[PDB]
């Protein structure tokens, strides 16, 4: 399910690992990056352990080298049932919400809670349902026949039960599930399904709810609408201070458990200094997600200050975070990556075209060639041949310019292009 | 008769089946490589396989960037959604720039559904209340071909009471959405009063209950707004509900993911088909770095439709950045995921052909000599100026009753109107700041 | 046949003059989507409350 | 979901009562004489 | 077809003219009266008829204009319709119009009949 066409990370699934945590050369869509995969795997098992919370880790490296794909493989390897939050640095800036509250809201979103409830439900086919008007003898008299394969019995309704059966029109011969404790009816189909067995069964219902979702409901009359509508608007901190204690008591009673989810922040270099100052306090608290931050830039100016801090982050935040460095890809890895994308996009590449695509990948960038591999398939589609050819790769190379070539063209054509001073010449002669 | 503003002479890219671009097709001269690489992008969009791909075209002013970006929208067809957008529109007072940028990505992917609606119509015979709670009402609607009675919800009864319907008045009731419309009093009661303000309509022909199916297409974002906020309804509680929070709000990622899931469950039944679209942003050089860096992460998403950018600049500083200098006013990290389509300036002959075809589409006759003058103009001043002076010359020809443009008329138009180069010369030598 | 031609043209002759073809123009009522995602979280709100 | 419109017959439908119903099967019949005479005389 | 007549009555009624309809759905007593009423000087601008019913043998001299929405056969049968207007008692020239759509079957019919000099039509294909 979940219709998706093609994604950049669509190929890599779950990073890759062995029981010794030693990464394989090619494992589950992940090539290259030996040490980075091992450190990211240590972080993954650290999250799965859940003994430690509120720790920050930094992923550093050149652009287009082993950075976002790491956190993607960690999120996919973490699997469903555990929370993972990915937000851009520009997304926390909001006109309606303050930067601090919008920054705390993610920390509340990244930690979930599982709540279990036991219910007794009676489900089965209804062959015959009789309902009678009020009489002097009794308020209402009715009998419904719930037929199942193993057992078939008749129940006498409870008044307001009759108001639930008359409330929503029910036709005999459909499979429904009636909730005794909840007091509502659930129709599972028509008799589409078959009766499994005994009418009444005791089941437990587990509900995974994040701390944020618990926090919004209590601050509003209807808070679940404030979840979807994003109108939440700076919940009081007192409410959260009550939520934490109530959750603690729920844990001591054993009625709930907490899952230490992960919080991933893309583009942390563009975060404001105030947010950096709040993160330091937010990490040291009791409930906090494991934080992973990735910045492409380094030795730049922090937003909000005049001075340039190293890596673009304040040193106070760098103390709380552990740094992981990624290395540029070699020539032998680029061809394997482009081959993985070829297998992902249903694109057939000859070895002769793979050599040129690898050479162009080394000379310019990987992101470029991986964009060309998609474009060349249509030029090959006009030739009606199923496999891409060298000539199609060259045509796709001359049609769509690179960045380095476009800069060298702009420098010669600068008189035609607009300039920072606003000067342009649209006249050909004189 | 036919209004023409800087356009409508371009009916498409005009490419053959082999992908080769003709010298002259559909109001396009020169620019063969850009039309070819553009048609490749057209086929890529028709393939639907790629997602989150970005292609920008960089060229000087008047080079035809935007005019080429309209041709791809004409080539995709009206069935494929196209969203023209300007980089200056991403700044909004009510909502942050980020939400306004993410929203357009959802507006660019169209999803067409099919659904059947039930319709009841007929003249009302009896109206009775079944009366804490507002009781239901039995309606006696009388079709021309039959008679049927139906019980109604209390809300649609409230809408009925607000429409001032009476016994013997033709009404229209929608089943699914519960909408209520009254056509008018029945034609048989027209003789009850000699003078009345109420019009009389004939009895609806056919059965009371009627069905049909609609292929109606709705953009995905329009479907998201429905789940996000309430919408108009004939009941008072609906008007108060929509009037409680009129201001637009930012949508959380959770609601978006759920709507995407129900979209998938809709495509599993074969009822709907998801098709991508093209997002076009004019003057990308006007965007702050905060929108660029968000475009870095947003294009990596799978649901992100193909986006096309246009900027004309040299090496310049990115808006919102102090010391950063990058080509085309775009950051270097964002330029990596982008593919570039270069545009070239036209020669004298191509300017002459442009003015010719624009004159033919404008429906105006131009003599050869005045046409050569317009070409020399186009070379010595600008391409836009020669296309600009065309109409005033025709107006002066209307004043002189002439049916064709003459050299004297285009010269007089040169005397009455000035371009930028002359006005700057008057600006350099003046008394007080002309 | 000769009958299929006439009976096929009578529909065009039932169009050009007036849209007599069954003349159904949609009233353009809104979409019927019944999901209301918040209703799925209503029960969770009840349990948490 | 719940239908806001419900078709109803004037004579057959009543808001009072709501009724829904769907080798060789044979309905059980008591052959006892005192049972039938007991039923008819009560 | 008679299904155009009611729509035309809702139109003429929308624009508020004075009209009278004569077709196969009327009686014999209301026919001659609706005829003499139109022939004598009155305020009725338009008189609606049908091809087979009242477009064959009547005497009407009143109208100076003939309008044809659709014509199937016009070697003869349609010629009788406008000849119902032009008569011995008309001192004014008859202006006869015709309604032909563009790029439709009716547009192909007269275009094929103009080249063939309008004898008889068989199949319309274009
Ligand atoms: N180890 C890897 N294995 C496979 N593909 C990779 C790997 N590292 C990077 N890529 C490719 O790089 C592209 C995105 O690069 P990314 O990791 O986002 O760079 P950055 O995070 O520095 O912006 C993806 O399309 C992915 O295919
Ligand atoms: N190849 C072409 N053929 C015909 N007209 C063109 C061509 N290229 C540009 N034009 C005309 O130039 C005018 C302005 O060009 P425009 O696309 O606005 O330039 P820019 O992309 O620099 O804004 C348009 O109205 C268009 O009709
Ligand atoms: Mg990144
Ligand atoms: Mg501290
Ligand atoms: Mg432009
Ligand atoms: Mg005669």
Curated annotation (Swiss-Prot), chain A:
Name a single GO biological process: DNA repair
The record, for SUPFAM superfamilies, names: P-loop containing nucleoside triphosphate hydrolases (SSF52540)
Q: Name one Pfam family in it.
A: TIP49
Q: What class of enzyme is it?
A: hydrolase
What is the annotated quaternary arrangement, including any partners?
A: Probably forms a homohexamer. Interacts with RVB1 and may form heterododecamers with RVB1. Component of the SWR1 chromatin remodeling complex composed of at least ACT1, ARP4, RVB1, RVB2, ARP6, YAF9, VPS71, VPS72, SWC3, SWC4, SWC5, SWC7 and SWR1, and perhaps BDF1. Component of the chromatin-remodeling INO80 complex, at least composed of ARP4, ARP5, ARP8, RVB1, RVB2, TAF14, NHP10, IES1, IES3, IES4, IES6, ACT1, IES2, IES5 and INO80. Also belongs to the R2TP complex composed of at least RVB1, RVB2, TAH1 and PIH1. Interacts with SPT15/TBP.
Q: Which PANTHER family match?
A: RUVB-RELATED REPTIN AND PONTIN (PTHR11093)
Q: Write down what this protein is called.
A: RuvB-like protein 2
Q: To which species is this protein native?
A: Saccharomyces cerevisiae (strain ATCC 204508 / S288c)
> Quick one: which gene encodes this?
RVB2
Swiss-Prot record, chain B:
Q: What EC number(s) would the UniProt record show? A: 3.6.4.12
Which superkingdom heads the taxonomic lineage of this protein's source? Answer: Eukaryota
Q: Name one GO cellular component term.
A: chromatin
Query: Top-level EC class, please?
Result: hydrolase
Tell me one GO biological process term. Answer: regulation of DNA-templated transcription
Give the residue spans that cross the bilayer: none
Q: Which reaction does it catalyse?
A: ATP + H2O = ADP + phosphate + H(+)
SUPFAM superfamilies documented for this protein: P-loop containing nucleoside triphosphate hydrolases
> Which InterPro entries does this UniProt record tie to the protein?
AAA+_ATPase (IPR003593), P-loop_NTPase (IPR027417), RuvB-like (IPR027238), RuvB-like_C (IPR041048), RuvBL1/2_DNA/RNA_bd_dom (IPR042487), TIP49_P-loop (IPR010339)
Q: Does the keyword Nucleotide-binding apply?
A: yes
GO terms for molecular function, please? 5'-3' DNA helicase activity; ATP binding; ATP hydrolysis activity; DNA helicase activity
State the compartments where it is located: Nucleus
- Quick one: which residues bind ATP? 59-66
What keywords were assigned to this record?
Acetylation, Activator, ATP-binding, Chromatin regulator, DNA damage, DNA repair, Helicase, Hydrolase, Nucleotide-binding, Nucleus, Transcription, Transcription regulation
What this chain does, per the record? DNA helicase which participates in several chromatin remodeling complexes, including the SWR1 and the INO80 complexes. The SWR1 complex mediates the ATP-dependent exchange of histone H2A for the H2A variant HZT1 leading to transcriptional regulation of selected genes by chromatin remodeling. The INO80 complex remodels chromatin by shifting nucleosomes. Its ability to induce transcription of some phosphate-responsive genes is modulated by inositol polyphosphates. The INO80 complex is involved in DNA repair by associating to 'Ser-129' phosphorylated H2A histones as a response to DNA damage.
Family stated for the protein in its record:
Belongs to the RuvB family.
Q: Any idea what this protein is called? A: RuvB-like protein 1
Please name the gene that encodes this protein.
RVB1
Swiss-Prot record, chain C:
Taxonomy, superkingdom:
Eukaryota
Signal peptide location: none
Compartments, as annotated in UniProt = Nucleus
Give the UniProt family note.
Answer: Belongs to the SNF2/RAD54 helicase family. SWR1 subfamily.
Functionally, this protein is described as follows:
Catalytic component of the SWR1 complex which mediates the ATP-dependent exchange of histone H2A for the H2A variant HZT1 leading to transcriptional regulation of selected genes by chromatin remodeling.
Please tell me what else the database record remarks about this protein: Present with 656 molecules/cell in log phase SD medium.
According to the record's subunit comment, the protein's assembly and interactions are: Component of the SWR1 chromatin-remodeling complex composed of at least ACT1, ARP4, RVB1, RVB2, ARP6, YAF9, VPS71, VPS72, SWC3, SWC4, SWC5, SWC7 and SWR1, and perhaps BDF1.
**Which protein is depicted?**
Helicase SWR1
Q: Which organism is it from?
A: Saccharomyces cerevisiae (strain ATCC 204508 / S288c)
> Where is the organism placed in the taxonomic lineage, from the top?
Eukaryota, Fungi, Dikarya, Ascomycota, Saccharomycotina
Curated annotation (Swiss-Prot), chain D:
* Signal peptide positions on this chain: none
Highest taxon of the lineage? Eukaryota
Q: Where in the cell is it found?
A: Nucleus
Q: How does it assemble?
A: Belongs to the SWR1 complex at least composed of ACT1, ARP4, RVB1, RVB2, ARP6, YAF9, VPS71, VPS72, SWC3, SWC4, SWC5, SWR1 and HTZ1.
What exactly does this protein do?
Answer: Participates in the catalytic exchange of histone H2A for the H2A variant HZT1, an euchromatin-specific factor, leading to chromatin remodeling and changes in transcription of targeted genes. Indirectly involved in vacuolar protein sorting.
Name-wise, this protein is Vacuolar protein sorting-associated protein 71
Q: Quote the gene name from the UniProt entry.
A: VPS71
């Amino acid at each position: 399910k979940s219709l998706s066409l093609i994604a950049a990370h669509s190929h890599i699934t779950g990073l890759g690992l062995d029981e010794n945590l030693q990464p394989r050369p090619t494992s589950e869509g992940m090539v290259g990056q030996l040490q980075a995969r091992r450190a990211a795997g240590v972080i993954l098992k650290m999250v799965q352990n859940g003994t430690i919370a509120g720790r920050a880790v930094l992923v550093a490296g050149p652009p287009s080298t082993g950075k976002t794909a790491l956190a993607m493989g960690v999120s996919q390897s973490l699997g469903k049932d555990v929370p993972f939050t990915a937000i851009a640095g520009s997304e926390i800036f909001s006109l309606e919400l303050s930067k601090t509250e919008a920054l705390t809201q993610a920390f509340r979103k990244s930690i979930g809670i599982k709540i279990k409830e036991e219910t007794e439900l009676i489900e089965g086919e209804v062959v015959e349902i009789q309902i009678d008007r009020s009489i002097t003898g009794g308020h209402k008299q009715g009998k419904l026949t719930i037929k199942t394969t193993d057992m078939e019995t008749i129940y006498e309704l409870g008044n307001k039960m009759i108001d639930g059966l008359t409330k929503e029109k029910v036709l005999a011969g459909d499979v429904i599930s009636i909730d005794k404790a909840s007091g509502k009816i659930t129709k599972l189909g028509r008799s589409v399904q078959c009766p499994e067995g005994e009418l009444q069964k005791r089941k437990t219902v587990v509900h995974t709810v994040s701390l944020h979702e618990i926090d919004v409901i209590n601050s509003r009359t209807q808070g679940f609408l404030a979840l979807f509508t994003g109108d939440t608007g700076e919940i009081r901190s007192e409410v959260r201070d009550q939520i934490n204690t109530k959750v603690a008591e729920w844990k001591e009673e054993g009625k709930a458990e907490i899952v230490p989810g992960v919080l991933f922040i893309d583009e942390v270099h563009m975060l404001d200094i105030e947010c950096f100052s709040f993160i330091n306090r937010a990490l040291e608290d009791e409930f906090a997600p494991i934080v992973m931050m990735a910045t492409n830039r380094g030795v730049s100016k922090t937003r909000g200050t005049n001075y340039k801090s190293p890596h673009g982050l304040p040193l106070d935040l760098l103390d709380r975070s552990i740094i992981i460095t990624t290395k540029s890809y070699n020539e032998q890895e680029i061809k394997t990556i482009l081959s993985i994308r070829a297998q992902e996009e249903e694109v057939e590449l000859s070895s002769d075209a793979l050599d040129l695509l690898t050479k162009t990948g080394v000379e310019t960038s990987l992101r470029y060639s991986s964009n060309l591999i998609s474009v060349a398939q249509q030029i090959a589609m006009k030739r009606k041949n199923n496999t891409v050819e060298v000539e199609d790769v060259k045509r796709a190379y001359l049609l769509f310019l690179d960045s380095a070539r476009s800069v060298k063209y702009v420098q010669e054509n600068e008189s035609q292009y607009i300039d920072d001073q606003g000067n342009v010449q649209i006249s050909i002669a004189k | 008769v036919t209004r023409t503003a800087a356009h409508t002479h371009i009916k498409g890219l005009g490419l053959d089946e082999s992908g080769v671009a003709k010298r002259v097709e559909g109001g396009f001269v020169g620019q063969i490589e850009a039309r070819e690489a553009c048609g490749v992008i057209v086929d890529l969009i028709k393939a639907k396989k790629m997602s989150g791909r970005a292609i920008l075209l960089a060229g000087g002013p008047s080079t035809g960037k935007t005019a080429l970006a309209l041709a791809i929208s004409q080539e995709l067809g009206p069935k494929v959604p196209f969203c023209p957008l300007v980089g200056s529109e991403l700044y909004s007072v009510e909502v942050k720039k980020t939400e306004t940028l993410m929203e357009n990505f959802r507006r660019a992917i169209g999803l067409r559904i099919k659904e059947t609606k039930e319709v009841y119509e007929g003249e009302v015979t009896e109206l009775t209340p079944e009366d804490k709670t507002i009781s239901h009402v039995i309606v006696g609607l009388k079709s021309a071909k039959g008679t049927k009675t139906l019980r109604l919800d209390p809300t649609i009864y409230e809408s009925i009471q607000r429409e001032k319907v009476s016994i013997g008045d033709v009404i229209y009731i929608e089943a699914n959405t519960g909408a209520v419309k009254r056509v008018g009093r029945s034609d048989a009661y027209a003789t009850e009063f000699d003078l009345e303000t109420e019009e009389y309509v004939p009895l609806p022909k056919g059965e009371v209950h009627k069905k049909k199916e609609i292929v109606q297409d709705v953009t995905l974002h329009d479907l998201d707004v429905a789940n996000a906020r309430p919408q108009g309804g004939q009941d008072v509680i609906s008007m108060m509900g929509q009037l409680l929070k009129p201001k637009k709000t930012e949508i959380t990622e959770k609601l978006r993911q759920e709507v995407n899931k129900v979209v998938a469950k809709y495509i599993d039944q074969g009822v709907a088909e998801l098709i991508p679209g093209v997002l076009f942003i004019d003057e990308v050089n006007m965007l702050d770095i905060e929108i660029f860096t968000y475009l870095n992460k947003a294009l990596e998403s799978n649901i992100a439709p193909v986006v096309v950018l246009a900027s004309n600049r040299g090496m310049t500083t990115v808006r919102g950045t102090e010391d950063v200098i990058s080509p085309h006013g775009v950051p270097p990290d964002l330029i990596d995921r982008l593919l570039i389509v270069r545009t070239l300036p036209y020669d004298k002959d191509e300017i002459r052909t442009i003015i010719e075809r624009r004159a033919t589409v404008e429906r105006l006759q131009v003599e050869s000599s005045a046409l050569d003058l317009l070409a020399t103009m186009g070379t010595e001043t600008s391409l836009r100026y020669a296309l600009q002076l065309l109409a005033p010359c025709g107006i002066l020809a209307q004043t002189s009753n002439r049916k064709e443009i003459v050299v004297n008329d285009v010269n007089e138009a040169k005397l009455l109107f000035l371009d930028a180069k002359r006005s700057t010369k008057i600006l350099e030598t003046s008394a007080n700041y002309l | 046949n000769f009958m299929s031609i006439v009976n096929c043209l009578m529909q065009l002759r039932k169009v050009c003059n007036h849209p007599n073809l069954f003349e159904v123009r949609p009233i353009l009522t809104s979409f019927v989507l019944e999901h209301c995602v918040a209703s799925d979280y209503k029960d969770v709100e009840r349990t948490l409350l | 979901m719940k239908a806001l419109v419900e078709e109803i017959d004037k004579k057959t439908y009543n808001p009072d009562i709501y009724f829904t119903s769907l080798s060789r099967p044979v309905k059980r019949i008591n052959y006892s004489l005192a049972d039938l005479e007991a039923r008819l005389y009560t | 077809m008679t299904k155009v007549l009611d729509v035309l009555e809702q139109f003429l009624n929308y624009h508020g003219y004075l009209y009278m309809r004569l077709d196969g759905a009327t009686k014999i007593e209301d026919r001659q009266i609706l005829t003499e009423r139109f022939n004598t000087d009155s305020r009725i601008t338009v008189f609606i008829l049908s091809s087979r019913s009242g477009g064959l043998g009547i005497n009407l001299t009143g109208a100076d204009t003939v309008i044809f929405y659709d014509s199937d056969w016009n070697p003869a049968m349609d010629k009788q319709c406008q000849d119902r207007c032009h008569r011995i008692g008309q001192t004014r020239d008859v202006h006869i119009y015709r309604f032909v759509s563009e790029h439709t079957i009716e547009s192909n019919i007269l275009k094929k009949a103009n080249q063939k000099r309008q004898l008889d039509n068989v199949v319309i294909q274009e």
